[PDB]
Amino acid sequence: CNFSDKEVEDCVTNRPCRSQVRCEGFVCAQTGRCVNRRLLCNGDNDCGD
Amino acid sequence: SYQSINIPVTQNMVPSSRLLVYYIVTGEQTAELVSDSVWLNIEEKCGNQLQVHLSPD
Numbered sequence: 001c002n003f004s005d006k007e008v009e010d011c012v013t014n015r016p017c018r019s020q021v022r023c024e025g026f027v028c029a030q031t032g033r034c035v036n037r038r039l040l041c042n043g044d045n046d047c048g049d
Numbered sequence: 050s051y052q053s054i055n056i057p058v059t060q061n062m063v064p065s066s067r068l069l070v071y072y073i074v075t076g077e078q079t080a081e082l083v084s085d086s087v088w089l090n091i092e093e094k095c096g097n098q099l100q101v102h103l104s105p106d
């Protein structure tokens with residue numbers, strides 16, 4: 001048959017999105033992982049990069 | 050911004066008062082009680098303000 005049994009299309013949406021899950025910690029710049037503020041400068045790469 | 054402490058100074062304060070201000074903030078999973086206080090110097094205004102004088106002078 002064929003690969004790709006799924007299609008995704010772009011949309012325009014007025015609907016609001018609440019995806020902004022809060023991060024009290026440090027939001028990693030590239031990865032956006034929410035690391036605890038205590039893990040900065042501990043010598044471990046707890047974020048990415 | 051936060052509201053000022055706007056409360057009027059009351060007659061029960063007149064010798065002196067102490068303002069303490071505090072909040073608990075519970076960031077991450079751990080609470081910290083945060084607080085400050087200042088000494089308030091209030092006028093020695095009497096509540097009844099009794100005054101005495103002789104009628105002739």
Ligand SMILES: [Ca+2]
Pocket residue numbers: 039040041042043044045046047
């Ligand atoms: Ca680290």
